Symmetry: C3
Subunit: 235 residues, 3 copies
C-alpha cells in the first residue's frame, strides 16, 4: 500500500509551511474592519501590511468607501451648529467587526472610534487629547476563533456597535504592528530603509457586499480569511 | 473663611497640568490651516499629530475639501496649454492663516506654496528642485498671540495672501515636528516602532464655515484653539 | 577674441552643477508612471520624493485620477460574483511606461501590478502572500535612454502592457529609494527625523493629456524629463 509515501511526507511539510506562514516576517498582516450598514449591506475595509499600519478612517471614507450632506456634517462638527433635518445619516454603519489573520503584536492594536472630528471618550479639546485613550487598546478584548484557522494563535476578532459609548457617527483610528519575539528590531537602523520602502503595500480596499452571507461566500471563504457571522459561527 | 482651601489648591495644580499639557510628549500638536474663500466662507484644514506631520495638499484637496474643471487644470499644468475660458477658479482661496497650538519645533515647520504641480519659488524643473526652498521655513516669521493662551509659548500664527509671490492657484506642502530639548530621540531605535504606529492619528479634517465669525464661534472658541481674526484680534 | 573667458568657465561649472544635481541628497527623485488609455489619451502619475516612496495605486486612483461601476467592481473583487454586462472598463489603461530621473537605487524599485484587490502573480490568498513577488523588482529590466539626458546614469525606462501576465484591470504598487554609496544612512538615528519630516513632499499628481504628442510637448519637454515615445525615440 501507499499508506505513508514520500509524496505524502512532502505534502505534510508543505502544510506546515503554509500554516506557519503568517509568522514569516516577509508575509502580510491582514486586518478586516467589517462595517454593517443600514440597508443590510456590508462594507469591509481590507488592509494588508507587512510590518505596521496607522490610519484614521474619516466619516467620509467610511460613509462612501451634497449641500444636504454638508448641512449634516455641520452638525457633527459643532453641537447644534448645522441646519440638517435628520439626526443621523442613512450611510452610517450600525455595528462593526475587526478580525485579524497575522502574527500581530496584540499590544500594538489600537481601535479608537470617535466623532466626525476624531474626538473620543468624550474628550473634545485638542489641548487635552492624547494618543492614548480609554477605549483604545483592544488587544485583551480580542477573542480567539475556530473555523478554518481553528487551533492557531494568529486569528482574533473584536466587535461592537456604534452607540453612544463610542460614537454613532464615527471616524475610526486603526493601528497595529507585527510581533517580534527576537532581539533584532525591524525598525532598527539596519531595517528602517525596508520599514518605509514597503510601508505602502497594500492600500486599504473598501469592499461592499449585498449582505453578510454574500460577504462570507464571495470574500471571506474564497480568500481563506477568518470571520464570525452574526450567529457566532466562525469560518 | 474658605479663602485658601485644599480644594482650591488641587484646582490650581490641575490648571497647571492643563496649561502645560502641550509639552506632554503623548499629547497632540495641533495645526490649523485656514483658507479664505471667494464667497466669504472659510475652509479650515485641521490637523492633529503626536510627533510629526508631512503632507502636500493638492489643488484638488484644497478646492473641494468636470470637463470645465479639467480644461482649467490643463492650463495650470502647462503654460498656455488649456482651453479654459476663465483665468482663475471660483474655488481657489485668496488668503490663508496657519495657526499652531502645540510644543512645535519652530525650525521644523515648512509651508511651501506652489502651483498646481507643486512648483515653488519660480523653480519649474524637477531636476533643479530641492526639498529646501526660499519661502519655506516660516518659523522665524511666526508671531505669538494673546487670547485664551496669552502668555504661553506654544501658540503661533502666520498668514498671507495667495498672490504672485507664491501662487494664486495653489498646492501647499506642510510639515512639522514636535520639539525635543532632551537627549533621547523620539525617532531613536527604541522609539521608531511608536513614531510609525501613531503616525496616522489623526487624519486631516476639512472644515467649511459660512464665514469667519461662524468659524470662530462654532470651532475656534469651543475647541479652545488660538485664532487671529481679520481685525487682528487674538482668541 | 573671447574664445575662453571667465564668463564661459563659470557657465561650464554651472552646467556640471546642474547635470550632477540629481546626485545631490537634497534633490528629488522623479518618477513618472505613464498609463495609456483606451481613447488615446495619456494619464501620467507624476511623483517627486527626496528619499523614498511607497504607495499602491488602487483601481480607483488609476481609473479616475455608479451602480454600473459598482457592479463591475463586484466582478473584479470575486470571480463570477458581479452582475455587470461588460468584461472590462473603458477607463482601464492598456499599457504603461515607468520612467525615472534621479539617483535611484535600482534594487529598491518595486512595481507590482495586481488585480483589483492587489493580488499579483496569481497568488490570491492573503495568508500565502509576501512583500516579494515574481514580477516585482524591475531594476535589472530598466533600460537606459538617450534624449536630453543621454550619457547620464540616472535615467531609466521600463514599459509593458496590462495583459494576463500581470493584470488587465490593475492596481499598481510602486516603491523606490534614493541610492547611497556612502557609509552614513539617511535613515540613521540622526536622520530619521528628516526622513519623515520630508516624507510627504510631493503628493502624486495625476496628469491627463489628450495624446502622447501632447504629453511630450506640454509636459515631458518643458519640464525637462526623459521619455521614450511609442516609436522608441528618447527625449
Ligand atoms: N479628580 C477626579 N476624581 C474622581 N473622578 C474623576 C476625577 N477626574 C476625572 N474623573 C472621572 O473619570 C472619568 C473619565 O474622565 P476623563 O476622561 O475626562 O479623565 P480625567 O482624569 O479628567 O482626564 P483629563 O485631565 O484629561 O480630563 C469620568 O467619569 C470622570 O468623572
Ligand atoms: N515560527 C514561529 N514563529 C513564531 N511563533 C511560532 C512559530 N512556530 C510556532 N509558533 C508558536 O507556537 C505555537 C505552537 O506551534 P506548533 O503548531 O508547531 O506546535 P504543536 O505541537 O502543534 O502544538 P500547538 O497545539 O500549540 O499547535 C503556535 O501556535 C505559535 O503561536
Ligand atoms: N550667479 C548669480 N548672480 C547673481 N544673482 C543670481 C545668480 N544666480 C541666481 N541669482 C538670482 O537669485 C534669485 C533666485 O534665483 P534661483 O531661485 O533660480 O536661485 P539660483 O541660485 O539660480 O539656484 P538654481 O541653480 O537652483 O537655479 C533670482 O533673483 C536670480 O536672478
Ligand atoms: N514641562 C515643560 N516642558 C517644556 N517646556 C516647559 C515646561 N514647563 C515650562 N516650560 C517652558 O518654560 C516657560 C515658563 O514656564 P512657567 O509658566 O512654569 O513659568 P512662570 O514662572 O509662570 O514664568 P512664565 O512667565 O515664563 O510662564 C513656558 O512658557 C515653557 O516654554
Ligand atoms: N514543488 C514544486 N515543484 C515544481 N514546480 C512548482 C512547485 N511549486 C510551485 N511550482 C511552480 O512554480 C510556479 C509559481 O508557483 P507559485 O507562485 O504558486 O510558487 P510556489 O513555490 O508554489 O509558492 P507558494 O508556496 O507561496 O504557493 C508555478 O509554475 C508552479 O507550478
Ligand atoms: N557626485 C556624485 N555622486 C554620485 N555619483 C557620481 C557623482 N559624480 C559622478 N558620479 C558617477 O560617475 C559618472 C561619471 O561622472 P562624470 O560625468 O563626472 O565623468 P566623465 O569623465 O564625464 O565620464 P562619464 O562619461 O562617465 O560621464 C556619473 O554618470 C555618475 O554615475
Ligand atoms: Mg515550495
Ligand atoms: Mg476630565
Ligand atoms: Mg498547531
Ligand atoms: Mg486628574
Ligand atoms: Mg536659477
Ligand atoms: Mg506661564
Ligand atoms: Mg549658483
Ligand atoms: Mg504555489
Ligand atoms: Mg558624464
Amino acid at each position: 500500500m501507499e499508506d505513508y509515501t514520500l509524496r505524502e511526507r512532502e505534502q505534510e511539510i508543505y502544510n506546515r509551511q503554509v500554516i506557519k506562514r503568517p509568522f514569516d516576517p516577509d508575509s502580510y498582516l491582514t486586518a478586516d474592519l467589517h462595517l454593517y450598514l443600514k440597508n443590510g449591506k456590508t462594507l469591509t475595509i481590507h488592509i494588508e501590511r507587512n510590518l505596521f499600519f496607522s490610519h484614521e478612517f474619516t466619516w467620509e471614507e467610511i460613509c462612501r468607501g451634497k449641500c444636504d450632506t454638508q448641512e449634516y456634517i455641520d452638525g457633527l462638527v459643532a453641537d447644534n451648529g448645522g441646519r440638517s433635518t435628520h439626526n443621523s445619516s442613512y450611510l452610517e454603519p450600525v455595528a462593526f467587526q475587526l478580525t485579524l489573520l497575522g502574527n500581530f503584536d496584540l499590544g500594538s492594536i489600537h481601535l479608537r472610534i470617535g466623532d466626525y472630528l476624531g474626538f473620543r471618550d468624550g474628550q473634545r479639546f485638542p489641548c487635552k487629547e492624547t494618543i492614548h485613550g480609554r477605549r483604545d487598546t483592544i488587544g485583551p478584548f480580542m477573542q480567539g476563533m475556530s473555523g478554518k484557522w481553528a487551533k492557531e494563535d494568529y486569528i482574533h476578532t473584536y466587535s461592537g456597535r456604534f452607540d453612544c459609548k463610542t460614537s454613532r457617527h464615527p471616524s475610526i483610528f486603526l493601528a497595529f504592528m507585527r510581533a517580534n519575539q527576537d532581539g533584532h528590531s525591524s525598525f532598527a537602523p539596519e531595517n528602517m530603509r525596508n520599514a518605509l520602502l514597503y510601508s505602502g503595500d497594500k492600500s486599504p480596499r473598501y469592499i461592499l457586499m449585498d449582505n453578510e452571507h454574500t460577504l462570507i461566500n464571495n470574500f471571506i471563504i474564497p480568500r481563506c480569511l477568518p470571520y464570525r457571522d452574526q450567529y457566532g459561527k466562525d469560518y
